[PDB]
């Protein structure tokens, strides 16, 4: 199957707003990032906004980045990642980013999880926003990347002052 992205998580107050690249479809079947408990990205976060994502409701965990002003979406709307020999997103559906000065006013800083996202990222520096190349969240990048979370840090600290 086609892997298909998420409706976008916001609120009217955000800062950050967090573009991933294509969801899994582990997060997929579930409807929810967190439907992979290998997305470290609510412990990437959540140490550096000081309030524990990971141990909440996949509700509340999302009300507490409302709060912190973060939002989450994706870039690939749709997207061909299954078993084969590249394994490379074929498809070519993507999110319209000409609204974001309209759905996020606030944005200052857009966070690409992922390369896949990142490569997309001199698209967005034309909207007049501040964009940062995060990594990816999930595990295979997370059992390599243990001083890297120290960047997610800088980033989410902010968000009080």
């Not at 690249?21 to 550096?48: C, M, T």
């Not at 990594?135 to 902010?158: M, Q, T, Y």
């Amino acid at each position: 199957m086609i892997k298909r992205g998420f409706p976008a998580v916001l609120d009217e107050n955000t800062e950050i707003l967090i573009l991933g690249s294509l969801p899994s479809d582990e997060s997929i079947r579930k409807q929810q990032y967190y439907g992979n408990p290998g997305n470290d990205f609510w412990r990437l976060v959540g140490h550096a906004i000081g309030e524990n994502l990971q141990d909440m409701a996949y509700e509340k965990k999302l009300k507490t980045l409302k709060h912190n002003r973060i939002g989450l979406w994706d870039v690939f709307k749709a997207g061909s990642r299954e078993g084969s020999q590249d394994s490379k997103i074929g498809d070519e559906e993507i999110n319209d980013f000409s609204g974001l000065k309209e759905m996020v006013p606030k944005l200052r800083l857009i966070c690409f999880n992922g390369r896949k996202a990142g490569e997309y990222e001199p698209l967005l520096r034309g909207m007049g926003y501040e964009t940062k190349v995060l990594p990816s969240s999930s595990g295979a990048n997370r059992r390599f990347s243990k001083n890297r979370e120290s960047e997610w840090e800088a980033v989410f600290r902010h968000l009080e002052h």
